[PDB]
């Protein structure tokens, strides 16, 4: 049963990136102010925070197996910090324009960055963070990158050019380009993580969320109801729901079978920008970042 409890919410500057640690009860937030925070959401104490830069940090992820956080900011730079010591492991210019999104491979030492420079870049931390590949083809800002968890030799990029492109690590052209019909662009793309459906999901400034079968390229469903830009939409990894968030200030939970809204939450933090789901469904935790802070919720 859906039984939504607020486990921890705190106010801060606008949070643009958010991520859960897989084994510690921690959430990373990356802020428009250039600050990043790691909170223990069970004790409600900060474990570490860093003023990384003075520009927005739009992307941030844990790399748990290396005890790192990796962040990307509007100063064009990727930085990596050890969260146990605070050491800055690396700091390099990744793109000649804003970084929108960072994804990390589940097993291999690879990080993808998507940028306003129209590209996705692949960096290898076992090769001194060498640029190993640039994926070219998109025609506007690359807003989101996500590995396919069932086949992480492939990944998806969501773009303001109104397409999603799915790529193979070996290869210079997309395996396919999805024409979303979301004419104000794609802000977010996510994969359904379970093996029973080959589904992806896209969110747009055109107020819609769409579900896609990536084998046939068909639109399975269109989810309508948000009243401003949809910043993200994701499949919960465990529960049969989809969770979206919007500049309309709401989170929406949708039934992933009927595609009808189940719950709309106004958490009171103004516009919603980002989402994380706990890597293994611990307490069904989700977390979202907003204009005025973040919240960590237990869905039941």
């Amino acid at each position: 049963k859906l039984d939504i409890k607020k486990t921890f919410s705190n106010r801060s500057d606008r949070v643009k990136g958010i991520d859960f640690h897989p084994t510690e009860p921690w959430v990373l937030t990356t802020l428009y102010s250039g600050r990043v925070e790691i909170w223990n959401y069970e004790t409600q104490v900060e474990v570490r925070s860093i003023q990384v830069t003075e520009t927005p940090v739009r992307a941030g992820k844990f790399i748990a197996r290396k005890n790192w956080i990796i962040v990307g900011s509007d100063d064009f730079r990727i930085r990596v910090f050890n969260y146990n010591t605070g050491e800055k492991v690396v700091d390099f210019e990744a793109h000649p324009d804003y970084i929108r999104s960072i994804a990390v491979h589940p097993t291999k030492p690879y990080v993808l960055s998507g940028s306003d420079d129209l590209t996705v870049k692949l960096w290898n931390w076992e090769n001194n963070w060498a640029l190993e590949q640039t994926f070219e083809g998109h025609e506007h800002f690359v807003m989101c990158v996500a590995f396919n968890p069932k086949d992480p030799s492939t990944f998806a990029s969501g773009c303001l050019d109104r397409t999603v492109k799915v790529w193979s690590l070996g290869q210079s052209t997309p395996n396919f380009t999805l024409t979303t019909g979301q004419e104000r662009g794609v802000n977010y793309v996510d994969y359904y993580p379970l093996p029973d459906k080959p589904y992806m999901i896209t969110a747009s400034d055109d107020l819609t969320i769409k579900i896609w079968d990536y084998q046939t390229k068909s639109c399975v469903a269109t989810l309508e109801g948000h009243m401003s830009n949809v910043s993200f939409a994701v499949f919960h990894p465990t529960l049969p729901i989809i969770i979206s968030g919007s500049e309309d200030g709401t989170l929406k939970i949708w039934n992933s079978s009927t595609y009808k809204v189940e719950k709309t939450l106004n958490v009171g933090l103004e516009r919603s920008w980002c989402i994380a789901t706990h890597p293994t469904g611990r307490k069904n935790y989700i977390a979202s970042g907003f204009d005025n802070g973040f919240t960590v919720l237990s869905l039941a």
Partner: peptide, 6 residues
């Protein structure tokens, strides 16, 4: 000209 600046 840059969109999504916020």
């Amino acid at each position: 000209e840059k969109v999504h600046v916020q």
